[PDB]
Amino acid sequence: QVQLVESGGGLVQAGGSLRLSCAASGRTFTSYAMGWFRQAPGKERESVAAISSSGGSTHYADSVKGRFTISRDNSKNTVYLQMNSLKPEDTAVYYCAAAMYGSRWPDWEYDYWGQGTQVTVSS
Amino acid sequence: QVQLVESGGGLVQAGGSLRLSCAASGRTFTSYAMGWFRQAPGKERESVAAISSSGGSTHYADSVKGRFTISRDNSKNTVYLQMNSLKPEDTAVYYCAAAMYGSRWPDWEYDYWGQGTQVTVSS
Amino acid sequence: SERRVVAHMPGDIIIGALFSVHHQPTVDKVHERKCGAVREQYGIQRVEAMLHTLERINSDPTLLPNITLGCEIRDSCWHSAVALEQSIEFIRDSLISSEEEEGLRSKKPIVGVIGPGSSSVAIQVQNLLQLFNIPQIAYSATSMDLSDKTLFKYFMRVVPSDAQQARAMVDIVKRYNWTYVSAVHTEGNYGESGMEAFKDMSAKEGICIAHSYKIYSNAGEQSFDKLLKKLTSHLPKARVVACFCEGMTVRGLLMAMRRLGLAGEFLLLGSDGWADRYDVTDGYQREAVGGITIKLQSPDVKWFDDYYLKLRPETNHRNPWFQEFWQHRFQCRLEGFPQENSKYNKTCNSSLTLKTHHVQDSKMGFVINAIYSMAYGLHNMQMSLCPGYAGLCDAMKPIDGRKLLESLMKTNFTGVSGDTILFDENGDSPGRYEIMNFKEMGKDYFDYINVGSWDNGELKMDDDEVWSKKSNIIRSVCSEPCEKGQIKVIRKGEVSCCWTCTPCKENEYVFDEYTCKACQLGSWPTDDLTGCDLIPVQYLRWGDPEPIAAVVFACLGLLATLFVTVVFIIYRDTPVVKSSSRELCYIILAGICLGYLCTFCLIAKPKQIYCYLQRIGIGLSPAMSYSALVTKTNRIARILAGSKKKICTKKPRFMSACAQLVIAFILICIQLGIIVALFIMEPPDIMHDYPSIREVYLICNTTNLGVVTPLGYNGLLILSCTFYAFKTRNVPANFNEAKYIAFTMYTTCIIWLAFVPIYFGSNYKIITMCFSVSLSATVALGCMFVPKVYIIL
Amino acid sequence: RRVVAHMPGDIIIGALFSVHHQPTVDKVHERKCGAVREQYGIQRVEAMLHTLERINSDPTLLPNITLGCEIRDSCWHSAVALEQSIEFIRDSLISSEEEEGLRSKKPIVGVIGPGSSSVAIQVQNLLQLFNIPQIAYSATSMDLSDKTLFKYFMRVVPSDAQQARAMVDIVKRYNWTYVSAVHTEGNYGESGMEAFKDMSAKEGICIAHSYKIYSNAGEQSFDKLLKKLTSHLPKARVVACFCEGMTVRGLLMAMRRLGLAGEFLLLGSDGWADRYDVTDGYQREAVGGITIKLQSPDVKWFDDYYLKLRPETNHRNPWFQEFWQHRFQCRLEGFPQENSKYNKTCNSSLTLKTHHVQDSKMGFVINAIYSMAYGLHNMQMSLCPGYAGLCDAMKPIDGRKLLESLMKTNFTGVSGDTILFDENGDSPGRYEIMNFKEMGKDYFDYINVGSWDNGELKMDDDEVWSKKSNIIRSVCSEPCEKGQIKVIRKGEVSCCWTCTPCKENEYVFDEYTCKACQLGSWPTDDLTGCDLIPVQYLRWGDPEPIAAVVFACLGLLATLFVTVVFIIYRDTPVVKSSSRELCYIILAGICLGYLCTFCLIAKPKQIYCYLQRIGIGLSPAMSYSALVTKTNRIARILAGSKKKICTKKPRFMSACAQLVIAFILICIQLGIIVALFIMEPPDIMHDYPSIREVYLICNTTNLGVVTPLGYNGLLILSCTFYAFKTRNVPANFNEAKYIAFTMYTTCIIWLAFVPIYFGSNYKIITMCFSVSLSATVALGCMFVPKVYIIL
Ligand SMILES: *[C@@H]1O[C@H](CO)[C@@H](O)[C@H](O)[C@H]1NC(C)=O
Ligand SMILES: *[C@@H]1O[C@H](CO)[C@@H](O)[C@H](O)[C@H]1NC(C)=O
Ligand SMILES: *[C@@H]1O[C@H](CO)[C@@H](O)[C@H](O)[C@H]1NC(C)=O
Ligand SMILES: *[C@@H]1O[C@H](CO)[C@@H](O)[C@H](O)[C@H]1NC(C)=O
Ligand SMILES: N[C@@H](Cn1oc(=O)[nH]c1=O)C(=O)O
Ligand SMILES: N[C@@H](Cn1oc(=O)[nH]c1=O)C(=O)O
């Protein structure tokens, strides 16, 4: 039973950089893939990025190809997301979600989520 | 640790009968002897009744010798005291205690105590 | 800080499991307890079998209505420490249920586990399990030291013990003439107990074992090639290796056989460790050809056939290892699937299936039997404790394990092949076996093929199925059966089957397979050297043919006796015979005719009266043959020394010539009394002779002095008649009769001198005897009667 | 539920002490332990408590650090101590489940014990999953050196892999050959007996039958063991036991319950080394029993501490009351642990020193506790150098760092011994050997004999039995080897052989076979090599043929007596009137015959066989060539001139030429004998009639003597036909009559020679006998009337 904690949110200027953190409280974290979500105020919760359980096979949405960079750590059981080219339409409620028993991405199965975080990009 | 629960107190005419119950927590009750105390309000606390760990060797104060009857149960981990020949000077705060590393009675080095009970004997 | 992954399914009643998902850890990894790659046919196949079995049981209205059977499946990795960690992961809830309870809800406690699939790991796991009353039903724990219900109360299995696998392997090597086998067994007390039973039942059947070897299934090649270097030192003596080893050990042996150029060297027999396992032979299959092994018999499961092929990695959402299964058996990565394993290239097509090279597991029916055994045990608990309620009532809240054991020990139901599944007071369900062989079906097409079965000693097989030939591989026999009725067997003392061959002598016979007794005096061993037969004597009644010439010579002596007596006894016109005493020539003819009669009384079987007749012919016939001559020889002595020639002043005779003949009659019985005394001192009886071992004779009791005694008196009589007829050779009396008498005695004495060394030095002296008798009898008549009768014709 | 014997502290060290006896059958599923154990139990407990008293008072070892402990019972049983091991790691399990949401005690950093092998092997499998290192004190089985399999296990005692070596050396030293052996079930006795029967065959020590039996066997399943051990009497007199103490006491109980007291000796391992309790009550059935012991000295501290322990004072030991109950068999009035089943309430004047037996292995316990203490001390010195007490480097304590500290510990023992070990956790030690025998009448005692270290087995043989004629050596077949009796095994056991003597033709080539020698070669006295037997060469002559040699000397004297008046004194007119060469050739042939008589009794060399072949072929040829000249000189007058009228004159016109004609028949035999010399050379040959009988002869054929006889036989009839009517012809003082009488005398022995030579076994004195018999009468009947009548 693993719970997730998002952190690192807040205000940031346009075109800046930010590094969100997703701590995982629990064991067997090496046996899970990870997924990211964000939801703009008023919009729906879209899929953002993904990383496999063994690493290596990372995944990104086509809107964020090359701009956001995912990473994981299996020593501390924590994944990250170093972000670049921050734009005001990236103002959303981010989400970190663990996964197992999936299909071809984006079609995975997400059993847990986190408290979320808030980032607003000003101009 | 083993905790002790006294029960069975109230008002009774002298010369009647009453049965106090010393419920015991824990799971190692078979390796303890049991002891009894009472203390009238404004008086001292006296050593009253005792039983051994394996039963058999029971002990009674000579003030209550032959009048009170001790008993034990190792199935339910509970000792009792069926009292007879009640007298108004038996109005006291009864105590139940346990010990393991004792000497000759009444020197048993009691290492546990109970909540207590209140019996008043009227005339 | 490593953690495994449970494969749980929720329910009201939890049933644990131990399935060998991954390979056991190699060396320099066992302390990390990192399991290796997955196992396709002892692992995830078993997992999907258990999950579909609980699908079928949770859908059955018959078995446990209003009752949901959850499960947890944890890996075992064939290793004691790993499955012991998972057993602690089972009883963790039962431990915290006695510490959170008294002041100071997670899950339901596990009511009973199923597995694991070795022996030694199960023996490790029960020691935790019997402390919390949790019963264990195994499916492959077959070692014979699991019947001790005094020691192991809470253990069960639906397979029979290997204590009869050793019996079946002993019967197999009994049936194919095997004598001097090798045997390796894996360490851990599956192979230990199996090899112990095998080498205990080998000596009952007299099957010698070269050298037992133990080796772990985790042995590296530097510590593994020493095993084939030690097995090479019994070539071509030991051609068969009776393996109790598990599958990776046999595959290690095949790998080392390829890595030493020993392909096709020698056969090896195995237990169920590599019965239907193609994976222990794949890549190494040329080095295992002709290999025979056994198998605990199990049919196919048609349910799992149709269920298991319809399993997709995009559908199976209750099995954590199915993605890595899909990775490993197909050697590819998946793009969108969460378990990447990006080390594999060549991403899989989406058209793949499972039925390509599908190998159905051999023991997986037993797994379903064990799960059904747990199900019927809980069903019998419901029928025995909660009769009037559908579901868990308050009699099983919580469930006691001892009542579950009392239910489980008395389970009767039908198997997946309809077989009556039940067991003894030891938790051992009986079953049967099958025997296969791994041989070349097609060219570059090797396959296991059934041969025969086994049940309670009834070993039914097909010998022409194996080798397709009645001239098989070399029988593992140390010393060749050199027994030919003549060659004994001598063991050196080390091994009772490596003996030495030795022929026994012609005096010796095979009294026993390990010693040769000698026969008695003259008794001879028979053709197969078992009994001491006899050899007949040389009785010689009809005569040897060269002594038949001497017999015809004695016949001619009798004819000469007739030719003399026809003109001496009847035609008495001779004035000299009637002028002298006729009794002179009468006693001469009597002694001569008795000599020639006693010649023919010698070639006979020596009976009692026949030895009496031959002793008469040996003692009295030379006595009377000279008593013939001596009367007429010393009749002239009374004229010579008496009257005129030798003057003496006494007359040692009587005043009558008839009384002179009475005086001459005196010397006859003197030898006869001494021969009668020898008859008293020794009776004539039969005696056997054995000059050689083969040479057998039958003689009379003859002493050296027994013939010297009639000769010792007759020898001095020769000098007596010589002194009585010395000067008579120049006395011309009666046509020079005394001259021919002295010439006769001179002719006579020479052969009596010659007889002693020619009889004592010879080895028969019996034809020499009659030869001497006829030589003594011939010249006495040839030199006396012919000139006396023919000159007066 | 059991009762922990805990002492509080900052660092907890567990323990497993065998307080009670192991459960008997029909109680093991209840796991109810039996009565207490005085000398493997509460003695060890008070030893550990006083050891932690001494360590908690030492300013040297772990300052600012308090060492708590927990002691749980083990009862020698796998399941009981496995329950107590779960009671250890219960805190370590709940520390990973209460921690993540959803303080009891400190976790145990390391246990000490238990005191068997198999139970320790069970306990480590829980312990190595939680990195908790175990230091044992009596786990001595050799399958604990596998640090690949058992990483977190240590012991301060050596393995039993050298106890098997020492027992093998003991039974090697006292002539033992065919032993019995029982071992207890569980892999102490299994590993020990495996090592013993692996090292027995290297020393050639046969074992009758190995037996396994549990230490919980009831008598109905125990008496079968003595019924099976009885079937090797008096063959197997010794039983090599690896069994633990209750099994040996069960054996002694069954020996008393079968009347087999004083039957046979038994050797044991350290399972009953100093244990008086396994012999008490049964001590007459164990007399003369030898056993070994892992060597340990006494502890003087525990002597003075332990006797001063009273049941009214000891307030940290839960079993001390029941100890006081059981060893004294009484109840206590006021004490909380009554046990009122015992009557005869104890006096308050009792002490512990009455019948005090100090434990044998309890110094090792203190060594193990000190090993844990110095290991934690080295952790402090290696990780927390500048602080007195537990700093934040050991909070919590890792077990792997503790293992790396513990594997590299060097310190001094309680006897000052350097305590250290290999890369297998096995500290080396030495041994002592005792014997249980009658010191005094009704006073039986263990008594030291000798020690053992690395094969250096030093003992005292006169100490044991007080006698050099000991108990019967367990030898199956007696050593019947006498240099003549071979050894044949039946194939079952290589020490139960059969004895068989070997024949006189046979010699001991090997201990298991007898080879036969060659032709005539004879086996020596210890039957190892094939010596020879000399020939009967007979140069000086056998003494009865010496009579024949002197007879030939008399023949030479007669030759001299004739030649003194025939060769020199030639006044005889008849010799000069006829040819002198007649009598000259007669004397020449006769003298050469009597010369070739003496040329026969010799070693048959090449030239000596040539001389004997000359004397056998040409000397009978020339002995008749002597006679035949004068014999057939009368033939030219008889058949030639007047007597037999023939119309031819087969002679010459000279009497000297008539002698030349008579000279012709000499070399005809000589050419054939020369052809036989070419066809066969005279060489030496050996004879072997029997195995013992050895002779040396010449190469003699059957026809080799018939060939000079086959021509000479027809010459007899030739001279008979040439001198038939001459017996009635009165020529020269009736010379032809004596010549016919001479030939008549001569021909008989030439007839007689053939069967008397072929039938005999020597035929060589018969040969010279025949030569002298042929030479005697030819001169005795011819020369004496010819010379003496003309005197
Ligand atoms: C070998 O086995 C066959 C049958 O399996 C049997 O007929 C034969 O007698 C055996 N050989 C010997 C030497 O007994
Ligand atoms: C199982 O066997 C028992 C006898 O052992 C028999 O009484 C019972 O009827 C059997 N059950 C079934 C379902 O055949
Ligand atoms: C028996 O042992 C003694 C010494 O222990 C030794 O001298 C003797 O040779 C041994 N016996 C035999 C037959 O070797
Ligand atoms: C222990 O032995 C080591 C060598 O093995 C040595 O360096 C060290 O000084 C020794 N310690 C003591 C206290 O003697
Ligand atoms: N059943 C075997 C276990 N086993 O070993 C193998 O190699 N296969 C396999 O099933 C046993 O009794 O130990
Ligand atoms: N040390 C022995 C254990 N042991 O067994 C006994 O009977 N005494 C005793 O100490 C062993 O190595 O197993």
Q: Does D337 touch chain B (CB under 8 A)?
A: yes
> Which residue from A minimizes the CA distance to C315?
A103
**Annotated binding residues of C:** 42, 119, 140-142, 190, 272, 363
> What is the distance in angstroms between the Cα of B108 and the nearest Cα belonging to chain D?
7
Q: How was this structure determined?
A: cryo-EM
The whole-angstrom separation of Cα D456 and Cα D770 is 82
Distance from C-alpha of B78 to C-alpha of B25, rounded to nearest angstrom: 9
Rounded CA gap, D298 and D292, in Å?
Answer: 17
CB atoms within 10 A of CB C227: 18
Q: Binding residue per annotation — D584? A: no
> What is d(CA D269, CA D432) in angstroms, rounded to the nearest whole number?
11
Reduced to 3 states (helix: H, G, I; strand: E, B; else coil), residue C7 is strand
Give the Cα-Cα-Cα angle D349, D350, D356 (nearest 5 degrees). Answer: 150
Q: Which atom of ligand 6 is nearest to the CA of D273?
A: 8
Indicate yes or no: CB of B101 within 8 angstroms of CB of D338: no
> Which is it for the CA torsion C732, C737, C738, C744, positive or negative?
positive
Nearest CA in chain D to C28: D148
Tell me which DSSP letter residue D347 carries. Answer: P
Structure tokens at C318: 């209750």
DSSP per-residue codes, D220-289:
GGTHHHHHHHGGGTTT---EEE---HHHHHHHHHHHHTTT-TT----EE-GGGSS-STTTTT-GGGGTTE
Q: Is C577 exposed, middle or buried (0-12, 13-18, 19+ CB in 10 A)?
A: middle
Using DSSP's 3-state secondary structure scheme, residue D154 falls into strand
Identify the DSSP state of C44.
I
Of D3, D334, D335, the CB nearest to B28: D3
End-to-end CA distance of chain A: 41
Q: How far is the CA of D410 from the centre of ligand 4 (A)?
A: 6
For atom 9 of ligand 5, which residue has the closest CA? C273
Beta strand A17-25 with A3-7 is antiparallel
Q: CA of D759: which chain C residue's CA is closest?
A: C762
Chains B and A in direct contact, meaning 3 or more beta-carbon pairs closer than 8 angstroms: no
Given ligand 5 and candidates C77, C272, C278, C363, which is best to mutate, with the most ligand atoms within 8 Å of its CB?
C272
Rounded Cα distance between C293 and C351, Å, is 37
| Interface size between B and D, measured as CB pairs under 8 A | 54
From the CA of D87, how many Å to the nearest CA of chain B? 14
Q: Which residues make beta-bridge pairs with D32?
A: none
Instruction: Read off the amino acid at residue A42.
Output: G
For chain A, the chains sharing at least 3 beta-carbon pairs closer than 8 angstroms are C
Strand partners, A69: A82
Which residue is listed with tokens 């009475």? C662
| Those residues with Cβ within 8 angstroms of residue D410's Cβ, 6 or more apart along the chain or in another chain | D418, D419, D420
Name the β-bridge partners of C515: C512
Name beta bridge partners: D446.
Answer: D436
Of C551, C538, C706, nearest in space to C617 by CA: C706
| Residue numbers in C near B26 (CB within 8 A) | 102
Residue C318 and residue A101: Cβ atoms within 8 Å? yes
How many angstroms separate the CA atoms of D495 and D26, rounded? 43
Chain C neighbors of D545, CB-CB under 8 A: none
Q: Which of C171, C172, C175, C177 to mutate to test the pocket of ligand 1 (most atoms within 8 A of CB)?
A: C177
C239 CB neighbour count, 10 Å cutoff: 21
Atom of ligand 5 nearest to the CA of C120: 13
Q: Which of D86, D748, D755 sits opposite C750 (nearest CB)?
A: D748
- Of all residues in chain B, the one with the smallest CA distance to C98 is B27
Q: Residue D415: CB within 6 Å of ligand 3?
A: no
Ligand 6 centroid to residue D452 C-alpha, Å = 19
For residues A58 and A51, is the Cβ–Cβ distance under 8 A? yes
Among residues 17-36 of chain A, which lie with CB inside 8 Å of chain C? 27-28, 31-33
Which residues are within 8 A (CB) of B79 and not within 5 positions of it... i.e. 6 or more apart? B22, B24, B34, B51, B70, B71, B72, B73, B96
How distant is the Cα of C268 from the closest Cα of chain A, in angstroms?
A: 43
Closest ligand 5 atom, residue C249 Cα = 7
- DSSP 3-state of D181: strand
Contact (Cβ atoms closer than 8 angstroms) between residue B83 and residue B22: no
- Chosen for mutation from C334, C348, C350 (greatest number of chain A CBs closer than 10 Å) is C334
User: Can chain B be said to touch chain D, i.e. do they have 3 or more Cβ pairs within 8 angstroms?
Assistant: yes
Long-range contacts of D326-330 (CB under 8 A, 24+ apart): D326/D35, D326/D36, D326/D38, D327/D38
Top residue of C32, C106, C121, C151 to mutate, by most chain D CBs within 10 Å, is C151
Closest ligand 1 atom to the C-alpha of C177? Answer: 1
CA-nearest residue for atom 13, ligand 5, is C118
Nearest-angstrom CA–CA distance, D480 and D485: 7
Instruction: For residues C368 and C307, give the distance between their C-alpha atoms in angstroms, rounded to a whole number.
Output: 14
Cβ < 6 Å from ligand 1: which residues?
A: C 175, 177, 481
Strand order in the sheet with A58-60: A10-12, A117-121, A92-99, A33-39, A45-51, A58-60
Closest alpha carbon within chain A to C350? A104
Give the number of the atom of ligand 3 that is nearest the alpha carbon of residue D174.
5
> Resolution limit in angstroms?
4.0
Mutate to test the pocket of ligand 5, among C155, C246, C428 (most ligand atoms within 8 A of CB): C246
What are the structure tokens assigned to C510, written together? 């095979």
Dist CA C341 CA C328 (whole Å): 9
DSSP secondary-structure letter at C636?
T
Collect all residues with Cβ–Cβ distance below 8 Å to D765 and sequence separation of at least 6: D542, D545, D548
Ligand 3 centre distance from Cα of residue D431 (Å): 24
- C-alpha span between D762 and C698 (Å, rounded): 26
Please list, in sequence order, all residues whose beta carbon lies within 8 angstroms of the beta carbon of residue D46, skipping any fewer than 6 positions away. Answer: D302, D305, D306, D309, D314, D317, D320
- Inter-residue contact C216 to C186 (CB < 8 Å): yes
Nearest by Cα to D254 from D212, D222, D293, D292:
D222
Burial D587-610 (b: 16+ CB within 10 A, else e): bebbbbbbebbeebbeebeeebbb
Contact state of D335 with B100 under an 8 Å Cβ cutoff: no
Where helices occur in C130-236 by DSSP H, the ranges are 165-175, 191-202, 225-231
Give D-chain residues touching C99 at CB under 8 angstroms. Answer: 90, 94, 104
Interface test with D, best of B1, B52, B108 (most D CBs within 10 A): B52
What the block records as the tokens of C385 is: 């404790």
| Residue D658 near residue D648, CB atoms below 8 Å | no
CA–CA dist D420, D407 (Å, integer): 9
> Ligand 3 atom closest to Cα of D461?
5
Strands A17-25 and A10-12: unpaired
Indicate the domain borders of chain A: 1-123
Looking at this protein, which amino acid is placed at residue D582? L
Chain A contacts of C338, Cβ < 8 Å? 32-33, 52-53, 99-102, 105, 108
Q: Beta C433-442 vs C420-421: how paired, if at all?
A: unpaired
| Exposed e or buried b per residue across D186-214, where buried means at least 16 C-beta atoms within 10 angstroms of its C-beta | bbbbbbbbbbbbebbeeeebbbbeebbbb
Residue D272 tokens, joined: 């009953």
